[PDB]
Amino acid sequence: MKVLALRHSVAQVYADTQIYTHDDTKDSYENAFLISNLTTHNILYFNYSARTLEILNKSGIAAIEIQSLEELFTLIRCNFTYDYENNVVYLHDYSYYTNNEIRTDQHWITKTNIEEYLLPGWKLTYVGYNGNDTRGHYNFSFTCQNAATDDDIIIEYIYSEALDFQNFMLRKIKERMTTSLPIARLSNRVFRDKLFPLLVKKHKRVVNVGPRNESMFTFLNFPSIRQFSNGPYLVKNTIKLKQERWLGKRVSQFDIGQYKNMLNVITTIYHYYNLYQEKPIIYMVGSAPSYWIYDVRQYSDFLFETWDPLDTPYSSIHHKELFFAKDIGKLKDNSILYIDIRTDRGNADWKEWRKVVELQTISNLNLAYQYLATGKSKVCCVKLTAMDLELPVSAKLLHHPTTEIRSEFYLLLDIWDVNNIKRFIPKGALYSFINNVITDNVFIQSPFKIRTSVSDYIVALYALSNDFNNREDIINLINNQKQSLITVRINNTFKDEPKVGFKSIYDWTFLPTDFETTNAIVTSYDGCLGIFGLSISLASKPTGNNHLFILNGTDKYYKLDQFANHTGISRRSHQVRFSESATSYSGYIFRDLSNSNFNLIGTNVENSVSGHVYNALIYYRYNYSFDLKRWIYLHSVEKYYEHAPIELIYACKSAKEFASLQDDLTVLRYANEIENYINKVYSITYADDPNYFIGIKFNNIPYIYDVKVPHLTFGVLYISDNMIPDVVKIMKSMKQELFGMDVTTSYTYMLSDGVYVANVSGVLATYFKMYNLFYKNQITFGQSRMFIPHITLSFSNNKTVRIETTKLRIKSIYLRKIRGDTVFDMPE
């Protein structure tokens, strides 16, 4: 939506493409609301106060100050993510292709030969995390940087099994200039970066579920988190594999040895974090060039100590040019040891040189056992060729990709992988692992058992919703659990399909109303950006991979008009009402017809009902950022605004009817889901065949009438005959809000056959309060019909006569017994 707030005396409207203008000082909250229901994508907000920007930025709507026009305004056009507490703009613009470069955020790729393999004239540069080395280009009122990088192209290529690179990047560079900016995917690495370091301090613990190599680096300075994912591959499960022979396969023009050397270490550490909640010393041998070190130090600071003949530019201590051979007792315990002692064949005979590779492998294991023989908290990660070896069963294999597959895989070990566990593995049982099994993830820790906990702050962002997880176990994990941040997918389709996918995998799909939480928000992506200190410039789409977010047990459940609020509620309706092929009164006509006020749709300008909810139900696909359920519970019990209980049912009933004609079975369910939850948090009682009624007499009715005493039957009630004395409290306590309300009549109509009446206006708000006042005193009031206030005139069938809006005022009020000869109260 991208609100751009411009200087009062310096501000221009030009022939732009998606620009509305807004300017007012009516209210801070009410102005932001009126903005947030505006249609277009780019809005100029000419005279402003900081609090109207606060509310929007809190609502996930990116709203920012603009002080100048030449570059501060033209470059903040493009889409972005805004941290509204440190005033940093994370742009997501792929217009940097124009000066003919790609850009990464990993230093190691710059030292490859890749620029030989890019298209002619292109380069890569500006290597910083989130583009934090972009900010040197711009000089604004705010800090700014373009976090768009092409990590996708390079990393997918490695996992792509394709060999021509120019063909590859030319394909993908054309995909972005064709298809939609995946803004939600890009904004997550921003979200993840600030999401954890504050969460860790606030709760003192955290568990994450399903981390992928999106987060290879997020957690390197967080030992005290415990991540769970797909389990590892074990030596225990090589016995499955059919035998196979050397397969010389090349899948990368440019050498990516530094990438696996980075991943195998990183895997080794998250393992060490899994076992002990501490973080190690990191010894190394055989790995000099190590341009992947500087990538690591941008996140967490580790002590790297290396033994290699060649240059290690990036380390604390490069101890020797000798490679660590048997001086093994000189190592500290709190450690990991990464062994990559290797060789390179020259032109020597492969059949005889193979003998050398076998002997190193025997040695490299002897180093591993002697390491793990003495001290505790020691992990290894050792180099192996594919030959017959005696390996521990419970150990974990790794084959992160490389330049080319030529028979080697790495093994990592723990202290208990030595304690009397050993198996013999044949040769071709390893090649069968090498050649077909690519390791996908450095996070090889055990799966998350789906059950509630009370010490755990559980995060689960894109791990659950998979079809293979028990639906009810995740539901109960969400309902019967405090302390979390869970994400699940919304049922964004019609005909209520419970499982939705890509023709590869299906995922479980939810509505908001699957969950009877106790104190929790259930909002969208943009809403939770606001909760955690962020705001985004692009709105969510009605279809596509939208996801419910669920915050349990948080400080922000009571702060309703701040976060996950009624912002954005009517944005799509206003499009339908005025523009997209309908009359402006379409919603004002339908809901009265569907609630049996179909004779009268004149007074549907004002005094209609079913405001917030009817929009929340039929356009949930757009505005599920508004947690409807949280809105209702906090008005059951006053913890601004107030509507009667009755109005919410009519909002539900009309959405059913609407979804029936449309045949949108998902709204139709969602309407059923709500209305019996409305009848849950509070009951509703109906004096269907009442005994008493509240009546209002007037001085003079400016109409023709044959009924001997015209009156307004203001409401009916069914009570016991000694709760009269506490009914009369209410008439007495609000006698002037009835004498003081603008009763007006302007016309006659036909309420029904043989019942010719007037219309009364301007009274309902008092009627809705009166229903609430009687309610909590446990007094029945009102019928299941819609109370349309009317003054009876005659039992005939006549013509609607219009007069000027003539004010009527109150003779008296009275509480009358139906078919009785006496009353007991009448204010005056």
Added chain:
Amino acid sequence: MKVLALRHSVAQVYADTQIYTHDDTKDSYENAFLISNLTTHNILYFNYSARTLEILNKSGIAAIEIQSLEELFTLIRCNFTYDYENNVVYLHDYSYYTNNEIRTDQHWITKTNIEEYLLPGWKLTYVGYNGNDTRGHYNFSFTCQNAATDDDIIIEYIYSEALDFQNFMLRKIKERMTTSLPIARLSNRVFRDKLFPLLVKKHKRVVNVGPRNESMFTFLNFPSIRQFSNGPYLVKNTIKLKQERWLGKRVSQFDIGQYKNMLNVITTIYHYYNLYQEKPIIYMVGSAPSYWIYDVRQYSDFLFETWDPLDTPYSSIHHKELFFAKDIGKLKDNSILYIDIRTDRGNADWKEWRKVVELQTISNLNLAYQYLATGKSKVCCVKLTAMDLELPVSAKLLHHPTTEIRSEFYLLLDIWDVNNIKRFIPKGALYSFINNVITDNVFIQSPFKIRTSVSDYIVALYALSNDFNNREDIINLINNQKQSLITVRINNTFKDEPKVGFKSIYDWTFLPTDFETTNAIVTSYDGCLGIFGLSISLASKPTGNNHLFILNGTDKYYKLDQFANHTGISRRSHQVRFSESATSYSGYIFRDLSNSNFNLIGTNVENSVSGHVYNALIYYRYNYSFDLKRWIYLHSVEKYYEHAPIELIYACKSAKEFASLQDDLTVLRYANEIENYINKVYSITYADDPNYFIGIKFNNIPYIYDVKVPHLTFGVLYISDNMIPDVVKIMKSMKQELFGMDVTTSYTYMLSDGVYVANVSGVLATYFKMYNLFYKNQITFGQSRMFIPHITLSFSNNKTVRIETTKLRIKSIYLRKIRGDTVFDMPE
């Protein structure tokens, strides 16, 4: 399938269209099995014994004796349902259209004018229940009758809102001669007729869920059943309805007053059964012609006492030609009173004649209250026009259809509908009920709360599976419940769609493996016909509205090879193996490839594995009549046949692979559903890196070999060193089943690289038994690999050499320690 058993010396094969022949005396149930896996639809079985027919008829396969050819054989061609205990054939042939008639089983339609409204030349006749008046036409070795009637055409027409009848029947008569005979629909009224009268005595109390007007007459002689359905419409819910005026609507050329007069009584009774498990006297007034009485007496015998000026042919006592006016104390209590006191306008003025209709209505209510003022167990059903009246809230309205809508509806009352409950109803609130609300069902009793019970024998045949019922509540109703007969729909589609429908309503879809019952059958429609004394001639289709049946807590759980047995298991495979575009060994090749015996598919003629289950998994859509789960649990614990535990996993693993290539995600689930249930009822242990092994030495190996001692490693085991003394028991107890088994070798092969071996044959059955005796003695034995028995010859790579099948015999057996220098047992 329709097995027709022909006389030995009198039996003919002619140029017929779907005829196989079968004839053998091998073994009774093995013969029926071989039959039941035959392809075609009509089978001649030339020389037979009664027990082979018993098994099939018990298996739901209709199998019958044929003694003659001219008419006993030619007319038993057509499809039918067979009661194999009373030897009655219920034919389902619509060839009676040829002599130009329709046929009903309700006497009242014959006295209408309908034959004026049939197509020219047609008639209707032969009015008996199930066609029980057909049997006078045929003189066979068995009783027989054609239960095909055209109740559909007439009854749908009444509920169709269409007015031209010739156009109607001509449409539907053409639907049957176009589309498929719905047998699963016609055989149910047979099923329902014998299903309840035996069930009521056995369980002592029966509840049925969702009865429709399929069963208007089934239950009239069963008070002690308690039916539940959609609740009634109440006076309480007229307050919803918009006001409306007289709507003169004609929807039936022929008068169907007798139909509503039948339904309103019948509704009145099932109500009385609901309140008081009882059955009443049935007084009447205003209803003389009453040709619907004889329909009632064909099911249950009631005392009907009528007051009407005109002829009542069918009753016990037509007391007077005066109509029951105020002599009301002369009635017995245990009763229902049906009031239809009415009039017929002549040419009198409708505006003045209307006054008469109003006064009767006031009177007809006075009769109703005076009735229900004195005695207990009294139920009324009274005639009303649409006018303003003072009605009880809790009463129940009825507008079963009629000739034409001209402002009348009937009301029924109970004893508590009078006890200080009354409301005023306006005129047009009734017309709005009349004109739009057609009553659907005489069964207006309250819904079934979906929860388990221990006194209840619950039937639920086609009521559950609806999308609006909580899935888990019905699941737990099936799992956590004994004493029932539940039906649910099968997931007959691919891509595992949980809810399936007609684009009108969706219904919850199941697999068999959703349910961990304790002692229950989960079979098809045809299987349960066998259980209850029936058998059907048409097989179920792979797609269409197939339904799981679930019998809990019944005497027949242990009788495996009788009911819901392995009958029919391989019918579709044999079609695929030989005919439908594949080699006969296709299944014998695939399952070895998918279980890593892919080097060898020579010995897949015999000694293959995964027999019953692999067919039960990939063709479940055809043979879900075989409850796979019941088959497995009763072989976990011996309560004929025996296979090893190991074989069932390989059956599951191969179905996964099969369903992966096909991408049939439902088998793929169903395979996962089973294999961890296999690992549930019993564990499996694997000596993956064993310590000991069982070895077998031979006199002389007729091959070339370089290993110093060729041997058969018959099996491996991982045990403690003082469970040798109870391993040797089994070494001893089966020493001759090893010496006595037909060890044979016929060729060499390559088991793997550098391992050149022979093949051993004919030993596995002993190997599978041995696995079980070590098993229940809690001894590990076998690896996760498939044990392919082999004699090692040389560590080279050579050519398969074939020899004649040469028998090898045992020098000795021995239990050896892996890499040890001693043994401790060797039989000889």
